[PDB]
């Protein structure tokens, strides 16, 4: 159901410069529908969907340096299409909670 593309803000951490920069981009968030099976047959199926990217593209961005460090480039994924489906573990870290999109070690 309600899983939709929504603007978010992310944190690109520049470790050598002890700061992070914020960037708006587009990702997935919302609500999906699950059941918890009452009959536990080994041949189920037990399947649960979550809200994640159906398609994504990478974008590249200039990250300021500080005195004594060059500026650099960081490339990050951006979501084109969102849906309620399986979390794809080749590409994605499938967890309960991460540190959150805007997490920065310096603030």
């Amino acid at each position: 159901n309600s899983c939709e593309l929504t603007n978010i803000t992310i944190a690109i951490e520049k470790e050598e410069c002890r700061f992070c920069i914020s960037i708006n981009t587009t990702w997935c968030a919302g609500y999906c529908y699950t059941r918890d099976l009452v009959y536990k047959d080994p041949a189920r199926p037990k399947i649960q969907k979550t809200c994640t990217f159906k398609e994504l593209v990478y974008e590249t961005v200039r990250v300021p340096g500080c005195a004594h460090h060059a500026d650099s480039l960081y490339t990050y994924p951006v979501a084109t299409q969102c849906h309620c489906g399986k979390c794809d573990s080749d590409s994605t870290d499938c967890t309960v909670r991460g540190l959150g999109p805007s997490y920065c070690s310096f603030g």
Binding site: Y39, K40, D41, P42, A43, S89, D93, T95, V96, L99
Partner: protein, 307 residues
């Protein structure tokens, strides 16, 4: 609620960031849930969690400096159904005495870690059905004999996929009720010994997708209902329908396989009992069905069974 280091809410405690160098000894013994996240924690000490009779869940995730889990670390926690160990890149050693009796364990997750060996599970003895989910641990190369016995008196689901497993010894699953076994995405895995499924009940579902496994075992699959072997390229023959008596569903690699299945019927023993009553499906155990559902179906022109 509140605490010295860890954030707290409703007897759920979260110890975060780098100021956490060890597990606080002043943690309430009425804690429902403990989470250690982003800690500079080099070790998790012996009996560290022993003695929380209220403890349902333990999350240890994203700890870069964590190298060891001591003995008897998960013990005397009668209410623990869920342990989650995620993203510890420097953790190479889990003490074989770390996992003690945990009668209520449902879910043990070890994913994205350094560990070089499966965890030792023979002292867990859970009363519940257990999902053992061990994934994205590249340094795990082999599965010993009896690697899963005593994990649970109840049947077991074993996901060992996306590891570095190249070696599976005979009787690796002995003394175990196997509902489901997923070995997929271990790319260097060439051979299942003929005695893998010795002293094991099931599997009922087996996934060997994206492995170099050359051949399936001749016995131990009398209970196999669902076989998933996608992009399993040097698996060329396969057991005859008479050997896979339970199979209802196969998603395979070589279409000729699917034609072998569509062309050999099976099914009499009439059948029973009571599905009585009074583009896909939902619940139905009537044995309504059909020759094994198989894919890829040799749809795009072409015959089957060769000429």
């Amino acid at each position: 609620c509140h605490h010295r280091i860890c954030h707290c809410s409703n007897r759920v405690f979260l110890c975060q960031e780098s100021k956490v160098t060890e597990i606080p000894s002043d943690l309430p013994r009425n804690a429902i849930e403990l989470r250690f996240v982003l800690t500079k924690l080099r070790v998790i000490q012996k009996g560290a969690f022993s003695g929380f009779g209220d403890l349902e869940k333990i999350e240890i995730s994203q700890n870069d400096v964590l190298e060891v889990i001591e003995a008897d670390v998960f013990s005397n926690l009668p209410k623990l159904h869920e342990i989650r160990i995620e993203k510890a890149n420097n953790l190479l050693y889990i003490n074989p005495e770390a996992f003690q009796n945990l009668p209520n364990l449902q879910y043990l997750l070890i994913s994205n870690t350094g560990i070089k060996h499966l965890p030792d599970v023979h002292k867990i003895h859970s009363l519940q059905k257990v999902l053992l989910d061990i994934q994205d641990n590249i340094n795990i190369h082999t599965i010993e004999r009896n690697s899963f016995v005593g994990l649970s008196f109840e049947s077991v689901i074993l996901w060992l996929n996306k590891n570095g497993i190249q070696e599976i010894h005979n009787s690796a699953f002995n003394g175990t009720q196997l509902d489901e076994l997923n070995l997929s995405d271990n790319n260097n895995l060439e051979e299942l010994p003929n005695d893998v499924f010795h002293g094991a009940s099931g599997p009922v579902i087996l996934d060997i997708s994206r492995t170099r496994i050359h051949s399936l075992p001749s016995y131990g699959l009398e209970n196999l209902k669902k076989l998933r072997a996608r992009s399993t390229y040097n698996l060329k023959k396969l057991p005859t329908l008479e050997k896979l008596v339970a199979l209802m569903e196969a998603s395979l690699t070589y279409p000729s396989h699917c034609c072998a299945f569509a062309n050999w019927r099976r099914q009499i023993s009439e059948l029973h009992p009571i599905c009585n009553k009074s583009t896909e499906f939902d619940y139905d155990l009537c044995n309504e069905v059909v020759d094994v559902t198989c894919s890829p179906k040799p749809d795009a022109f072409n015959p089957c069974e060769d000429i």
